[PDB]
Design a protein around this ligand. Structure first.
Ligand SMILES: [Ca+2]
Ligand SMILES: [Ca+2]
Ligand SMILES: [Ca+2]
Ligand code: NA
Length: 481
């Protein structure tokens, strides 16, 4: 109950190889602040040392082998990583490892492959005849050899690429020809078929590939003692593959591994379809909510706060929603930039952390800041909200999303959690107040604002109602502290 996840990384982190050590030493602090699970960045070797990890080169090289001109990953060595995981385990924190199975970048060499070009806006349409290209599809892992795995990758393990080394044409997507070669299905349908994204696209129609990824999933889980996964680019991955990959790993390890997938599309309909096709066996990030939060912080007070949860995953399917404010996709200077403004960020974290539905995530970028882009650390403003969730956000929830600026909700608390109960009130515009029911058993209690934004107190009347206040463009969370 009331667990809280933290994405322990941001895109522009320094390439000093000291991140695992940072996580190691931060473990006890994170636990005290209310963090119960840590999602670590890609732990394997990327196309280069400074690769964030999504340009996944070798999933079996966790900063252990000399490959790509380096032994360590951007974050550190395998031993530093494992020492970090131990520190988290010792402090009772669950560990979720990132998972990148849609593609492989940084191939060791090229191969001559027969293929056709397809329409980038409709991959279902071939725009050229057949011809030979030079594709980066060969992986031999020279620095690792067969350690951990003898599986080698070749062009037939992929469906296509976006670069012909012999001609170097731009804005092209190549679909390989051959027995049983075709874009996978089912996948998101934007662009006709969104199977292809970047680098060499892994062919989930190939049995050797499916067998290899499942085996790696188990090895990965057992090697690091992972408790769950954060799955990358699932809208570009054959839906049934992801569903069954998760099932396989859970069954092979005997661990009911938690899993949250990133289906990045601001479309509830698309996300709900993904959930049905994967048989609801895992969660997804609430991307629609992220956009609602983002758009609200950009509307200068004119966003209708009554609709903040409209069209979101947490509203329609609370048990399968992982709620976040921002991540590495939406942070400054990214293709999908849509960063929730600072003034609104605290309201956003209050909206995800103090409500009873959804599994909230704290973004390292918001918590410790993003110095390369002028984003200050907001942990001083997040910690209070985290304490509210940890100690007060329990019991029955009463909603008051009844005003275009001032909205709020209360938690009545439960005996399982001593003194629990709260009244969150916020305004994306002018400040004000709102009467809310917190429970008749709270009659006479003198509540105060855990965020400290409001300095007075609010006494619950005989009938369990308190007249709570909030300042403009702010959030207050009253508790009986
Ligand atoms: Ca295929
Ligand atoms: Ca794909
Ligand atoms: Ca408003
Ligand atoms: Na594919």
């Amino acid at each position: 109950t009331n667990g809280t996840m933290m994405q322990y990384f941001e895109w522009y982190l320094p390439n000093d190889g000291n991140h695992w050590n940072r996580l190691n030493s931060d473990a006890s602090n994170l636990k005290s602040k209310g963090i119960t699970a840590v999602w670590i960045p890609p732990a394997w070797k990327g196309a280069s040392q400074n690769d964030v990890g999504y340009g996944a080169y070798d999933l079996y090289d966790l900063g252990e082998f000399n490959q790509k001109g380096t032994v360590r990953t951007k974050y550190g060595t395998r031993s530093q990583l494992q020492a970090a995981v131990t520190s988290l385990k010792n402090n009772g924190i669950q560990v979720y490892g990132d998972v990148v199975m849609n593609h492989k970048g940084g191939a060791d060499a090229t191969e001559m492959v027969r293929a056709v070009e397809v329409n980038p806006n409709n991959r279902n349409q071939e725009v050229t005849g057949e011809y030979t290209i030079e594709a980066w599809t060969r992986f031999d892992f020279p620095g690792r050899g067969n350690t951990h795995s003898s599986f080698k990758w070749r062009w037939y393990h992929f469906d296509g690429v976006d670069w012909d080394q012999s001609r170097r044409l731009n804005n092209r997507i190549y679909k390989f020809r051959g027995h049983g070669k075709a874009w996978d299905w089912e996948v998101d349908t934007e662009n006709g078929n969104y199977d292809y994204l970047m680098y060499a696209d892994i062919d989930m129609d190939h049995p050797e590939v499916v067998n290899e990824l499942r085996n790696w999933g188990v090895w990965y889980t057992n090697t690091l003692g992972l408790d769950g996964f954060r799955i990358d680019a699932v809208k570009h991955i054959k839906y049934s593959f992801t569903r069954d990959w998760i099932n396989h790993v859970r069954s092979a390890t005997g661990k009911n591994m938690f899993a949250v997938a990133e289906f990045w599309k601001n479309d509830l309909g698309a996300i709900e379809n993904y959930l049905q096709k994967t048989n609801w066996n895992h969660s997804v990030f609430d991307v629609p909510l992220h956009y609602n939060l983002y758009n609200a912080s950009k509307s200068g007070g004119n966003y209708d706060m009554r609709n903040i949860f409209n069209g979101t995953v947490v509203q329609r399917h609370p048990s399968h929603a992982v709620t976040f404010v921002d991540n590495h996709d939406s942070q400054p200077e990214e293709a999908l930039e849509s960063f929730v403004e600072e003034w609104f960020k605290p309201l956003a974290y209050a909206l995800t952390l103090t409500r009873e539905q959804g599994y909230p995530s704290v973004f390292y970028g918001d918590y410790y800041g993003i110095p390369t882009h002028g984003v200050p650390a907001m942990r001083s403003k997040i910690d209070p909200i985290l304490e509210a969730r940890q100690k007060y956000a329990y019991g029955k929830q009463n909603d008051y999303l009844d005003h275009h600026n001032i909205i709020g909700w209360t938690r009545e608390g439960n005996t399982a959690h001593p003194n629990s109960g709260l009244a969150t009130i916020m305004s994306d515009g002018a400040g004000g107040s709102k009467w809310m029911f917190v429970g008749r058993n709270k009659a006479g209690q003198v509540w105060s604002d855990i965020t400290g934004n409001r300095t007075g107190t609010v006494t619950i009347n005989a009938d369990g109602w308190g007249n709570f206040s909030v300042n403009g463009g702010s959030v207050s969370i009253w508790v009986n502290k």
